[PDB]
Design a protein around this motif. Structure first.
Motif, PDB file in Angstrom:
ATOM      1  N   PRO A 312       0.831  -1.119   0.030  1.00 42.46           N
ATOM      2  CA  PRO A 312      -0.183   0.078  -0.115  1.00 42.46           C
ATOM      3  C   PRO A 312       0.910   1.305   0.132  1.00 42.46           C
ATOM      4  O   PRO A 312       0.205   2.265  -0.277  1.00 42.46           O
ATOM      5  N   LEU A 313       2.118   1.003   0.232  1.00 42.95           N
ATOM      6  CA  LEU A 313       3.291   2.333   0.402  1.00 42.95           C
ATOM      7  C   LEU A 313       3.422   2.948  -0.801  1.00 42.95           C
ATOM      8  O   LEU A 313       3.871   2.307  -1.919  1.00 42.95           O
ATOM      9  N   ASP A 314       3.062   4.228  -1.024  1.00 45.85           N
ATOM     10  CA  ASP A 314       3.412   5.180  -2.157  1.00 45.85           C
ATOM     11  C   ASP A 314       4.711   5.670  -1.985  1.00 45.85           C
ATOM     12  O   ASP A 314       4.692   6.966  -1.211  1.00 45.85           O
ATOM     13  N   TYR A 315       6.006   5.371  -2.403  1.00 45.40           N
ATOM     14  CA  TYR A 315       7.350   5.979  -2.181  1.00 45.40           C
ATOM     15  C   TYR A 315       7.783   6.531  -3.348  1.00 45.40           C
ATOM     16  O   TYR A 315       7.431   6.215  -4.720  1.00 45.40           O
ATOM     17  N   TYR A 316       8.389   7.471  -3.302  1.00 42.35           N
ATOM     18  CA  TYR A 316       9.315   7.853  -4.494  1.00 42.35           C
ATOM     19  C   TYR A 316      10.747   8.072  -3.813  1.00 42.35           C
ATOM     20  O   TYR A 316      11.209   8.840  -3.409  1.00 42.35           O
ATOM     21  N   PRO A 317      11.666   6.892  -4.084  1.00 41.95           N
ATOM     22  CA  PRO A 317      12.787   6.794  -3.384  1.00 41.95           C
ATOM     23  C   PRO A 317      14.083   7.320  -4.108  1.00 41.95           C
ATOM     24  O   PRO A 317      14.212   7.141  -4.968  1.00 41.95           O
ATOM     25  N   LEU A 318      14.392   8.228  -3.020  1.00 45.24           N
ATOM     26  CA  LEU A 318      15.501   9.216  -3.883  1.00 45.24           C
ATOM     27  C   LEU A 318      16.666   9.520  -2.610  1.00 45.24           C
ATOM     28  O   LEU A 318      16.033   9.509  -1.429  1.00 45.24           O
ATOM     29  N   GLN A 319      17.784   9.650  -2.932  1.00 47.88           N
ATOM     30  CA  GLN A 319      18.576  10.242  -1.949  1.00 47.88           C
ATOM     31  C   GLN A 319      18.564  11.625  -1.366  1.00 47.88           C
ATOM     32  O   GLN A 319      19.123  12.171  -0.365  1.00 47.88           O
ATOM     33  N   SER A 320      18.331  12.504  -2.604  1.00 47.97           N
ATOM     34  CA  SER A 320      18.131  13.664  -2.460  1.00 47.97           C
ATOM     35  C   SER A 320      17.299  14.246  -3.516  1.00 47.97           C
ATOM     36  O   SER A 320      16.723  13.465  -4.514  1.00 47.97           O
ATOM     37  N   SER A 321      16.901  15.579  -3.579  1.00 50.37           N
ATOM     38  CA  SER A 321      15.764  15.955  -4.412  1.00 50.37           C
ATOM     39  C   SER A 321      16.110  16.146  -6.066  1.00 50.37           C
ATOM     40  O   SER A 321      17.264  16.352  -6.216  1.00 50.37           O
ATOM     41  N   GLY A 322      15.314  15.774  -6.879  1.00 52.99           N
ATOM     42  CA  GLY A 322      15.668  15.986  -8.200  1.00 52.99           C
ATOM     43  C   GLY A 322      15.262  14.947  -9.170  1.00 52.99           C
ATOM     44  O   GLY A 322      15.992  13.807  -8.756  1.00 52.99           O
ATOM     45  N   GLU A 323      14.547  15.258 -10.274  1.00 48.89           N
ATOM     46  CA  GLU A 323      14.377  14.106 -11.229  1.00 48.89           C
ATOM     47  C   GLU A 323      14.479  14.871 -12.628  1.00 48.89           C
ATOM     48  O   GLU A 323      13.879  15.882 -12.748  1.00 48.89           O
ATOM     49  N   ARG A 324      14.711  13.980 -13.664  1.00 53.58           N
ATOM     50  CA  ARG A 324      14.653  14.430 -14.925  1.00 53.58           C
ATOM     51  C   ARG A 324      13.621  13.431 -15.576  1.00 53.58           C
ATOM     52  O   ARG A 324      13.254  13.993 -16.691  1.00 53.58           O
TER      53      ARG A 324
END
Ligand SMILES: Nc1ncnc2c1ncn2[C@@H]1O[C@H](COP(=O)(O)OP(=O)(O)NP(=O)(O)O)[C@@H](O)[C@H]1O
Length: 424
Positions: A312-324
């Protein structure tokens, strides 16, 4: 009887694979690059040459006597400038991750907006930077990519590259030409002729046949980049086939009948045979997993996961901010909340969410025009996690498995094979 040699000159060392026509490996090996002399103007190139010779010597003599075609890959936008008469390397190579920002305005002034060359690390920025240092007799120079140069050491025909290596200097593999905006500038005179990856250039030089015992009719073929060679190793050749690399970051590559290039998302296409390899990469993946868990913890916790149950978990796994890609947002925040008490539930949530990001990436490529993904092969560290494979099969809603081969040098040996078959 005949065998086929592929070499991979990567970021830290060289590797080789020899196959028969059925793709069975007969020999393989690896060598780290040796130091070079401080005063050597060739710099790293002298090391790469040494490694080439070392790798050749490492091939068993009986195997060498059967090798009928050779190809190799090198790192993208690793750039050399040579004198056309003497073969002399005129400066230390511009490495793949080396940037020439001084040349970027000039490049932007001539190239179409958001063209792939409009990056400081592009081959074209390196060429323009070198050009603008005004070396005497610069008009008698020629540009070679790393792969091109190592191949030229073998066949002795100066100035040939391939569709893949040449992309970052501005070559258009769709028209099979350098575009007029590039040909209109004087440094265009340095550009190599360009063929398809894995096509014959010429016979192996007699010096190599005599020294190493290769057969007299051994040929040398154009190569490709290490990233593309690694893809080729998966032996997936139909539109809709894809490879996901579950490495430190998540990278996906999808074979397509339609070319796709989109600057917003950093999506770029390479030519592969008569098709297009469409690529994108996310900052999610192994790096954040490693930040949270050791390889051993990933192992053990993964065995407690039921991959047929959806988290059920909605994650966006990142070490730090930012995506392209697949989200174009330089400020995209990591999302690893809520974190449940159970590390198993936490991990399941992370793996499942990375699978959602993968799915979103393939959807984005499709909506940008790529042939829809039909089967997903897996490379990288994440490929050894069979629970994660099952999770991804469920979440992607597509068949997912392990790529059988992932080594760039294997892919290069497939190009050698292709070149030999085309030659006969
Ligand atoms: N059992 C596992 N399940 C999931 N991820 C794992 C597992 N074991 C290792 N990893 C991850 O695998 C990553 C290393 O993958 P790897 O693919 O070797 O990295 P890389 O530096 O990107 N090189 P590449 O092979 O070219 O993708 C690490 O970040 C680990 O977190």
């Amino acid at each position: 009887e005949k065998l086929y040699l592929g070499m991979d000159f990567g970021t830290s060392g060289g590797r080789f694979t020899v196959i028969d026509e059925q793709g069975e490996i007969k020999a393989q090996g690896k060598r780290e690059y040796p130091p070079f002399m401080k005063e050597e103007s060739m710099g790293w190139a002298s090391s790469w040459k040494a490694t080439l010779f070392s790798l050749l010597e490492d091939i068993p003599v009986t195997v060498r006597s059967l090798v009928s075609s050779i190809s190799l890959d090198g790192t993208s936008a690793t750039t050399l400038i040579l004198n056309s008469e003497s073969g002399e390397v005129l400066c230390q190579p511009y490495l793949y991750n080396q940037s020439c920002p001084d040349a970027l305005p000039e490049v932007k002034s001539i190239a179409p907006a958001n063209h792939t060359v409009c990056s400081g690390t592009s081959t074209l920025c390196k060429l323009v930077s070198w050009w603008n240092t005004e070396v005497p007799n610069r008009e008698s120079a020629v540009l070679l990519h790393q792969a091109d140069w190592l191949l030229w050491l073998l066949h002795g025909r100066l100035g040939v590259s391939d569709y893949n290596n040449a992309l970052k200097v501005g070559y258009d593999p769709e028209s099979e030409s350098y575009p007029s905006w590039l040909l209109g500038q004087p440094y265009s005179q340095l550009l190599p002729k360009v063929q398809a990856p894995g096509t014959s250039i010429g016979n192996l030089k007699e010096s190599f046949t005599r020294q190493f015992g290769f057969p007299d009719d051994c040929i040398v073929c154009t190569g490709t980049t290490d990233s593309i060679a690694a893809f080729l190793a998966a032996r997936a050749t139909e539109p809709g086939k894809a490879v996901t690399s579950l490495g430190s970051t998540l990278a996906i590559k999808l074979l397509s009948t339609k070319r796709v290039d989109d600057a917003r998302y950093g999506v770029y296409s390479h030519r592969l045979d008569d098709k297009w390899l469409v690529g994108g990469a996310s900052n999610t993946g192994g790096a954040i997993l490693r930040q949270l868990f050791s390889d051993e913890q990933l192992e053990r916790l993964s065995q407690e996961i039921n991959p047929m149950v959806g988290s059920p978990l909605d994650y966006y796994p990142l070490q730090s901010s930012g995506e392209r890609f697949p989200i174009a947002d330089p400020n995209l925040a990591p999302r690893l909340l809520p974190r449940p008490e159970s590390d198993v539930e936490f991990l399941h949530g992370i793996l499942e969410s990375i699978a959602r990001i993968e799915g979103k990436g393939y959807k984005l490529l499709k909506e940008l025009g790529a042939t829809e993904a039909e089967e997903v092969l897996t490379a990288g560290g994440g490929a050894k996690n069979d629970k994660w494979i099952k999770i991804r099969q469920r979440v992607l809603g597509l068949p997912v498995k392990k790529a059988v081969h992932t080594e760039a040098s294997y892919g290069a040996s497939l190009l050698a094979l292709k070149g030999a078959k085309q030659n006969s």
